[PDB]
Design a protein around this nucleic acid. Structure first.
Lengths: 120, 56, 121, 209, 114
RNA sequence: AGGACCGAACCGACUAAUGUUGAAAAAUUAGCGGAUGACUUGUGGCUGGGGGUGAAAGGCCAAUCAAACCGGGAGAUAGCU
RNA sequence: ACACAGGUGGUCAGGUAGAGAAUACCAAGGCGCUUGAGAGAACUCGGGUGAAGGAACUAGGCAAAAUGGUGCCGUAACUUC
RNA sequence: AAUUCCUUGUCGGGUAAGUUCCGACCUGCACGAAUGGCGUAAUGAUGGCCAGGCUGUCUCCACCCGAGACUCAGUGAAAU
RNA sequence: CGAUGUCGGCUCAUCACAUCCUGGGGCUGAAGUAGGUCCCAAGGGUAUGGCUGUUCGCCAUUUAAAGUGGUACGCGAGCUGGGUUUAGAACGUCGUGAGACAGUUCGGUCCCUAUCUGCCGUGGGCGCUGGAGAACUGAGGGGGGCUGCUCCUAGUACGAGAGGACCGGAGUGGACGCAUCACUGGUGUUCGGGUUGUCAUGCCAAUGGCACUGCCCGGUAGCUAAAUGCGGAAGAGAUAAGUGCUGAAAGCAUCUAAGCACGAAACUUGCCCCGAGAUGAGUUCUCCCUGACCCUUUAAGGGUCCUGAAGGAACGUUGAAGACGACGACGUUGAUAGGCCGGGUGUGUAAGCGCAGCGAUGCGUUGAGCUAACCGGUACUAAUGAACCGUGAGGCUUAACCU
């Protein structure tokens, strides 16, 4: 089957998965807490936390890399200016995932993914 | 791909003997607020087990 | 290596290209690596030699694109399959010179006679 | 002649001086502790109960703790048995357990098999897939005929079909030991052994050899 | 694991030179014809691996008598006794397969960092 | 110049796969033939049932054609079920 | 029959590459196709890539794979020229 | 032979091996001259045969990308 | 006949013995090698192609062998649709004609979402007589069972020569099966790089979207075969055909009537797996619960208060486990997953700056940058404390040791 395999297909193709993770990471960086489904949030940790780890070290190369991901300079500015200077001492674990109820149209187990040191 | 004889209400009942919902049978009561919730879930008052984690 | 496999010919008298029509030994044998003897038909023939076109005889595979496996874990890989044509009844090599390398698992009796004329082993 | 319980680490190669490059697998065999000895009076047969490894004493229940605390207390990962006919063993553990395999030449390794899951006929057995191009509407890797028309009227009780492949105890016979390391707690046998790395292995001397 | 490569560390040899793909190294191997042991020279352009531990194998290529011969060799085997770099090469690939199938085309030589 | 050549619109329907209680009472996908001409197409009209029309297949004549549909003779007849 | 992958005459015709009304990405403009959420079994559908061999498959090279453009050199039997 | 029963006629070519094919013979069961005989450049989504290239057709399958299958929530048939 | 799909091929089988090979013997006009015929034996094995729609057949080349049959001439709710057997057309022939032929030739729609039996797997409930955690015995049941060549015995026995053994050892193969990913490889649309067309990030530079992953070039983990290990035996018991010892009936003779000993891959074992629902429900080790009452036909129970034990289940993080259940690791006494840190790997010298050149571009910084699924660490994030089920010494009769 799948042995020693990681990642979730999420009933989507690869380009859609990359684009939806990009938009979800941008929304999480902007709003600092977003509500999505459970496996989307679980993959959102794995795509967001390397971006914060890259934002820890400030360079033009790292800014161009975190513009190659997330493709948004407002996200880049907020990240490299406020997220990583904030988590500079903290080594790992920038996102906390709290389970919530189910959606009304279909029973999707929802979850709040939120940055651990929220300004709000 | 069709039946030759009609299944009866007895066979229907023995088929539906495993179509029975199971209740949660356990609801956790939070510490900061006394209102109950599903285990490992937000209380819908915005509270997890330590603090009001969600403002909304 | 297999049935219907076109091999080139190493020796001078055995000519040009030959199609393998049977792998010998065993009941339902599928493959022939190096040291074993196959049956051939002669699809192309150089005009001079005792070999003629459309003649059934035997051949020993001196080169294989898959290659052999040394016991130390290493493989010797060639580009192109080659064979030396043998007699049908006596199973001795027909030509006088062998062209190209010939691998060390042709180390037994008649194949030692092939080593005696092979340039590089 | 009894054996002992190990754990599959992985597969490596051992370069001999001649250049043989022997493919080995490494079985981490710790000190097996004899827990209970069975005899012909209490039970109908004669064997010993062994344990290996250690547990965290929170997943050890009260019956397991009582059984371990009876005559030499040390919690282990599990319990196994090994039949014996002319051997007599104590109820305390073995100090250097792998050194009883330094004289043997051929062992016979037993472990679980890796789970392929719900597998088709072509994966489970060596069934032939049918044609891919010449017609063949929706019938490439399906089972073909499963029976013999009306005169039997039924499918026989041994019919090879699609089902679960794997998670079976597979016993591989007559494997050559190349090294027994006493202080490293290792036993190196030649070739392929069932299971993934971390599976529980049972090594015994060979019945065939 | 950690139990693995504790045996492999003792089974390495420390005399392996540094190779890049594109280098035309000369590999001296051991061959046994009869009761005697002899060294055989096999010179060719390398299409290598990076050192996977004991399981490191480099593939070299020689056009012997008009036929190209590709031989892999384990870089920790007792059969290989010595390897010598000879002429170095400047290529941009870790695998040189498309530059090994063609004939009459050669790899250029770099003076430094190759 | 051309019932000339390659090829889209347009017209057609040779092969395969899928669908067969279909998305569809004949289609879709990938290839396929013609593509300035005996082409193709819009609007209106004419030919009516032992009749029409047919580069002819018993083809077409309103999802129906070796004799349309509708109403009547009519509760035809049926030594058959 | 349907909020049905079908059928439906004419008119306009932007940019880059392109011979082009092909084709790829885009303008003005319009949409995301009226069930979703997970998991990543067999099996089916539509595709991608394969060691060595290359039609041995098969009723049959069915299907896939292959070649494909412009400029120049060069081109056979036969011919109604 | 779109025609031939015996018939896989006999001989030759092609293949290692050829009931099909191509070239001959004539023993035309039961060809034949506008119900047209013979030949033919060009044309053919026309029938048969061979060769090169090409390849999962196959030796013998292996992995992967997606839509279903599977589980949960909403609606909810059918032949018999 | 208000319908039982036809030949051949594909996939999958299972049975008979009238045995093709392998195994065991009698006879031979059996020297040996080779045979011929007959008896016993079904454990395993029993080709690939050319032509034809073909079963069949002929042929080529192997093999130890290329068995004969039954199963709706097995298998179309599994496949095909070449043959036959609709409608179009043609030839030969018949007929004045429409039309026709076991003739010939080209073309011609093969539907079903599985209720029941049946098998392949995987669970839920209850039983197993107090409740649990495990480890097992083994009544049964399946799997496997093939075999070539070379060398020694030994150019020995045998044979005029030619040739050439039995019996007994050893190596190495073919087909098949099980396991595995250390090696050689395949894939690896989640890793890196090159490059084309266009659009966007204000523009250069650098990136991203789309064009099959746009096209390629390599590639980690997993999965895999073509890769690598291993295996079908040795050895018992009882035998079939056969060969006998002793031995009368029948003063002898005779394997048989009494008695006794050999004898095959077949049988039962031995090897591997499932296996106590084996209701005949088994054995062993360990753990846990030893409080008050009330009502009452009393072959017996029912109800209240206090207590919930060992353990399990639910929930969450998950796995080389899995369709779902199930199974396994873990739940702050913690490395279960994600993150982070260090390596390994795999691409192949990133961005920015500086120099050379008219410029494409080259060079230094620089084996640089990036890196997944891998290895070793690290409590940073999520695995909350509860809560739920499971109770309170476990029936009757008879007998042994006590008392």
């Amino acid at each position: 089957m799948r042995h020693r395999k990681s990642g979730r297909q999420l009933n989507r193709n690869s380009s859609h998965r990359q684009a939806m993770f990009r938009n979800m990471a941008g929304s999480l960086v902007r709003h600092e807490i977003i509500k999505t489904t459970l496996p989307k949030a679980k993959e959102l940790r794995r795509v967001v936390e390397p971006l914060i780890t890259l934002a820890k070290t400030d360079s033009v190369a790292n800014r161009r890399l975190a513009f190659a991901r997330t493709r948004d300079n407002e996200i880049v500015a907020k990240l490299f200016n406020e997220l990583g200077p904030r988590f500079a001492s903290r080594a790992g674990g920038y996102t906390r995932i709290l389970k919530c109820g189910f959606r009304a149209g279909d029973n999707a187990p929802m979850a709040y993914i939120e940055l651990v040191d929220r300004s709000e | 791909a069709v039946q030759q004889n009609k299944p009866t209400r007895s066979k229907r009942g023995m088929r539906r003997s495993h179509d029975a919902l199971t209740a949660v049978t356990s609801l956790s009561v939070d510490k900061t607020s006394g209102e109950k919730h599903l285990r490992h879930h937000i209380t819908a008052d915005g509270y997890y087990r330590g603090r009001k984690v969600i403002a909304k | 290596i297999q049935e219907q496999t076109m091999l080139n010919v190493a020796d001078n008298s055995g000519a040009r290209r030959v199609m393998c029509i049977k792998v010998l030994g065993g009941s339902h044998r599928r493959y022939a690596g190096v040291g074993d003897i196959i049956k051939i038909t002669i699809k192309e023939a150089i005009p001079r030699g005792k070999v003629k076109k459309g003649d059934v005889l035997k051949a020993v595979v001196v080169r294989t694109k898959k290659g052999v496996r040394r016991p130390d874990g290493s493989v010797i890989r060639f580009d192109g399959n080659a064979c030396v044509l043998l007699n049908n009844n006596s199973e001795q090599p027909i030509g006088t010179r062998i062209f190209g390398p010939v691998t060390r698992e042709l180390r037994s009796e008649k194949f030692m006679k092939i080593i005696s004329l092979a340039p590089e082993v | 002649m009894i054996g002992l319980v190990g754990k599959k680490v992985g597969m490596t190669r051992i370069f001999t001086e001649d250049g043989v490059s022997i493919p080995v697998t490494v079985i981490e065999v710790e000190a097996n502790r004899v827990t209970q000895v069975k005899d012909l009076a209490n039970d109908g047969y004669r064997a010993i109960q062994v344990t290996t490894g250690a547990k965290k004493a929170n997943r050890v229940t009260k019956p397991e703790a009582g059984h371990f605390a009876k005559a030499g207390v040390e919690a282990g990962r599990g319990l196994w048995e090994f039949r014996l006919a002319e051997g007599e063993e104590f109820t305390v553990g073995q100090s250097i357990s792998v050194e009883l395999f330094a004289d043997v030449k051929k062992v016979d390794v037993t472990g679980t098999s890796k789970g392929k899951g719900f597998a088709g006929t072509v994966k489970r057995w060596n069934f032939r897939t049918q044609d891919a191009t010449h017609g063949n509407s929706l019938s490439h890797r399906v089972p073909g005929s499963i029976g013999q028309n009306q005169t039997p009227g039924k499918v026989f009780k041994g019919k090879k079909m699609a089902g679960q492949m794997g998670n079976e105890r597979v016993t591989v016979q007559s494997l050559d030991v190349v090294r027994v390391d006493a202080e490293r707690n290792l036993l190196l046998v030649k070739g392929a052994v069932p299971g993934a790395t971390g599976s529980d292995l049972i090594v015994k001397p060979a019945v065939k050899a | 694991s950690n139990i693995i490569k504790q045996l492999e560390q003792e089974q390495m040899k420390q005399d392996v030179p540094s190779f890049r793909p594109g280098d035309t190294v000369e590999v001296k191997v051991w061959v046994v014809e009869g009761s005697k042991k002899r060294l055989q020279a096999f010179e060719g352009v390398v299409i290598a691996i990076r050192n996977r531990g004991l399981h490191s194998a480099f593939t070299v290529r020689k056009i012997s008598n008009g036929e190209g011969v590709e031989r892999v060799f384990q870089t920790h085997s007792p059969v290989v006794d010595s390897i010598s770099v000879k002429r170095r090469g400047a290529v941009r690939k870790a695998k040189l397969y498309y530059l090994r199938e063609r004939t009459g085309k050669a790899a250029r030589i770099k003076e430094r960092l190759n």
